[PDB]
């Protein structure tokens, strides 16, 4: 009845999409070849006789990562034409993704997205998975978002993006790409959910007792978060919430649309036996700084809006009591202009566990989405990195050679300054 389209861009987006689609196939009992021995309609199409194809688009400017998908276990799951690949990557360059290489491919992906949307009767919106520090995941994501805003318009668009860590970075030119893509995608997004690799590393090390986490573990956790978000669309519960409610509840002002995600309970099978994972305990754990998925201090900011999504054996009265207990706590503070700052959703389906996974099976799960002013600190840090790097004009010629102008750098810096000023003004 109501359908949702998922787009995965770049290496990180494609791999997180692999994890998410594995999780969905496990949830709905669909085998990797598309056969199963009907709320899954929102995420899976039906073609012919007993074949289910995902409503997904996988885009990358280099063929390796998507060639892995076309060769791996889920080769028969995806339709051949929705796995679009280029020949040359963007090489961590925003300008290459935006102008030089992005322009040669975006028409095909737009055609495929239109073809997918033609088969939908109640399309709710889009989810795009990408990175901030990448080349294609920055430039092509910005170009695609602007084209989607021009084409579709009112339909909601939600981002899942990997926020660069404060001290743990892979690239050297990450601040340039992050600032440019934020400036370009500010006006064409409805809300963006933020995660950080360093925070997930710390969570795996502490709660899951894992010495050597890899990217697969992080992708599994991100897939669990996304499944918790979309369970309202893929199942039926006591109190449901679809895509538009997230946008209308978590965004107070059009430019302030960067909430961060949190999941609980994340524990191994060893510690799960000695714990009673009640609603109050997980609700409390969702609000501790050590459990959040973005490395930042919620204590140094004030919450604006909070969204709690419960799964499994949950009854509303304990939810009400837990939220009241949270409200009476002084350690965490809400802005004075938001007397009502909670959105509550309850679902009946408990969270499933992937075989060979790192999480233990549980009766309950909470996905908390919080809009807080503490993101201003991360924005200021990224802006400082950009200023330090741009003072000496380092790596600027790489961007200029691909079609970018230094005026774009200046405009992006000005827009970021305006954004942090807006955050500071809202805080008071």
């Amino acid at each position: 009845m109501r359908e949702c389209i998922s787009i995965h861009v770049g290496q990180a987006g494609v791999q997180i999409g692999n994890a998410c689609w594995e999780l969905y196939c496990l949830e709905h009992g669909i085998q990797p070849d598309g056969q199963m021995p009907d709320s899954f309609n929102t995420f899976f199409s039906e073609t012919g006789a007993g074949k289910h194809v995902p409503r997904a688009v996988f885009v990358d400017l280099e063929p390796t990562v998507i060639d892995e998908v076309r060769t791996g276990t889920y080769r028969q799951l995806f339709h051949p034409e929705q796995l679009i690949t280029g020949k040359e990557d963007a090489a961590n360059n925003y300008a290459r993704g935006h102008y030089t290489i992005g322009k040669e491919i975006i028409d095909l992906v737009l055609d495929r997205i239109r073809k997918l949307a033609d088969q939908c009767t109640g399309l709710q919106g889009f989810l795009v998975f990408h990175s901030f520090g990448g080349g294609t995941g920055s430039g092509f994501t910005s170009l695609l978002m602007e084209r989607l805003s021009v084409d579709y318009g009112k339909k909601s668009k939600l981002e899942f993006s990997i926020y660069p860590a404060p001290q743990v970075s892979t690239a050297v030119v990450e601040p340039y790409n992050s600032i440019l893509t934020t400036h370009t995608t500010l006006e064409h997004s409805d809300c963006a959910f933020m995660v950080d690799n360093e925070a997930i590393y710390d969570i795996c090390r502490r709660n899951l007792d894992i010495e050597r986490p890899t990217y697969t573990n992080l992708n599994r956790l991100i897939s669990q978060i996304v499944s918790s978000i979309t369970a309202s669309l893929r199942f039926d519960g006591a109190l449901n919430v679809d895509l538009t409610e997230f946008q209308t509840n978590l965004v107070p002002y059009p430019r302030i649309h960067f909430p961060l995600a949190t999941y609980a309970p994340v524990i191994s099978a060893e510690k799960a036996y000695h714990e009673q994972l009640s609603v109050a305990e997980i609700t409390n754990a969702c609000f501790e700084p050590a459990n959040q998925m973005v490395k930042c201090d919620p204590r140094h900011g004030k919450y604006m809006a909070c969204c709690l999504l419960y799964r499994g054996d949950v009854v509303p009265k304990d939810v009400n009591a837990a939220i009241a207990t949270i409200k009476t706590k002084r350690s965490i503070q809400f802005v004075d202009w938001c007397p009502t700052g909670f959105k509550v959703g309850i679902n009946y389906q408990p969270p499933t566990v992937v075989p060979g996974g790192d999480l233990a099976k549980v009766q309950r799960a909470v996905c908390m989405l919080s809009n807080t002013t503490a993101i201003a600190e991360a924005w200021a840090r990224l802006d400082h990195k950009f200023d330090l790097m741009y003072a000496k004009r380092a790596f600027v010629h790489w961007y200029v050679g691909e079609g970018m102008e230094e005026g774009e750098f200046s405009e992006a810096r000005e827009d970021m300054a305006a954004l942090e000023k807006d955050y500071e003004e809202v805080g008071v």
Binding site: M1, T121, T248, P316, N320, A324, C338, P339
Partner: protein, 426 residues
């Protein structure tokens, strides 16, 4: 005889309507296949009030189910008693309001209101003489709030001489289920003040409180709250369906309870309510019924009547009882608590007795109170609205759908005026 049209809007409205129809079908001896299977002919004498005879001794409820998303419609259709509803009465959209009042009232509601009004008009033309309409919805949502408001306005335009009842749940004082609740609640109250004859205010926190302390329920569910609400709805309209000693229909209650047209917000209540263990330790009599009724713990609205004064009170009794005891007890409670009753209205209490009690219970009673303590709830909603509107938070979501700031100002002014009147007559 006298016919009532039922409308359900939004998720909460649809759920409460489903529970209410299950309870009603239990009362009248109808299985979920539409056939009559009761024993007493009293269940069939006045069955035309709620049901339609559709050939082959099958009965279809006279209800219209309305929503902007197909989810709740599918959930209600697939659940128990989902077969009795007429397939043509399911009017649903594809987009959904997304907890936005402007979407429900101006964008999507404007699209679906013509179809829902067509269905309502057909149903009302079918019946020989209709008493009025009743609607179940919520003030914190976007579909229920705006859509029920628009439907109420359109119906009152079409049928100005009939009775308009609403059973709307209101935002709670302690915990909110939506960030933008005050906006929707304020606008909905602004419209309901003009376009409704009597409104019953239900609070989720009060229902949780009742289920916890009184019913001793360890893990209450939304089904239990809907059960209590449905019990109240059934208790309100008992005199139209069963014989009794002193009969009071909807218009009698309306004439008795609302002295001034803007003061028509009530707090319902039900008795008896006992746990499983404590059932043995009391005897079913009228005194315990009036003790349970006149008690802040049993109130279904999150307002304590002892901070205000009662304007009028309705006590609708069911079962075989003595009128002398009822009148004596109402006189006694009025005399003992004279400080809580308005002094310029003698005999604040209106009484009605029906012979047929609810199935399972020997005796029952439904309490309707029109107190001035509702000003506390209205004041809290107004103050939250003002705090939000000072900084224009979340305002662009409503403004992008055609809403103007003057609408918000008018709604705030109406809320303030209503609170001022309630304080004035106190």
């Amino acid at each position: 005889m006298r016919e009532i049209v039922h409308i359900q809007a939004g998720q909460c409205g649809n759920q409460i309507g489903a529970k209410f129809w299950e309870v009603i079908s239990d009362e009248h001896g109808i299985d979920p296949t539409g056939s009559y299977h009761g024993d007493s002919d009293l269940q069939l004498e006045r069955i035309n009030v709620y049901y339609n005879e559709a050939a082959g001794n099958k009965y279809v409820p006279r209800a219209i189910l309305v929503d902007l998303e197909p989810g709740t419609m599918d959930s209600v259709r697939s659940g128990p008693f989902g077969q009795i509803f007429r397939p043509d009465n399911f009017v649903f959209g594809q987009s959904g309001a997304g907890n936005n009042w402007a979407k429900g009232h101006y964008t999507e509601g404007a699209e679906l209101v013509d179809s829902v009004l067509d269905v309502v008009r057909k149903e009302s033309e079918s019946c020989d003489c209709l008493q009025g309409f009743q609607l179940t919805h919520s003030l914190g949502g976007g579909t229920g709030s705006g859509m029920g408001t628009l439907l109420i306005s359109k119906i009152r335009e079409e049928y100005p001489d009939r009775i308009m009842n609403t059973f709307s749940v209101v935002p709670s004082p302690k915990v909110s289920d939506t960030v933008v609740e005050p906006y929707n609640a304020t606008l909905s109250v602004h419209q309901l003040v003009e376009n409704t004859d009597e409104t019953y205010c239900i609070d989720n926190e009060a229902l949780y409180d009742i289920c916890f302390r009184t019913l001793k329920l360890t893990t209450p569910t939304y089904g239990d709250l809907n059960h209590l609400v449905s019990a109240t709805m059934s208790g309100v309209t008992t005199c139209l369906r069963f014989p009794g000693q002193l009969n009071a229909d909807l218009r009698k209650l309306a004439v008795n309870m609302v002295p001034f047209p803007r003061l028509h917000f009530f707090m319902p209540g039900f008795a008896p309510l006992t746990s499983r263990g404590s059932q043995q330790y009391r005897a079913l009599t009228v005194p315990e019924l009036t003790q349970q009724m006149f008690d802040a713990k049993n109130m279904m609205a999150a307002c304590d009547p002892r901070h205000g004064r009662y304007l009028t009170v309705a006590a609708v009794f069911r079962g075989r009882m003595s009128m002398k005891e009822v009148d004596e007890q109402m006189l006694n409670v009025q005399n003992k608590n004279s400080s809580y009753f308005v002094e310029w209205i003698p005999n604040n209490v209106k009484t009605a007795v029906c012979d047929i009690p609810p199935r399972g219970l020997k005796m029952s009673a439904t309490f309707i109170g029109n107190s001035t303590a509702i000003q506390e709830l209205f004041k809290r909603i107004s103050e939250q609205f003002t705090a939000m509107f000072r900084r224009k938070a979340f305002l662009h979501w409503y403004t992008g759908e055609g809403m103007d700031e003057m609408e918000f100002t008018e709604a705030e002014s109406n809320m303030n005026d209503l609170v001022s009147e309630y304080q004035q007559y106190q």
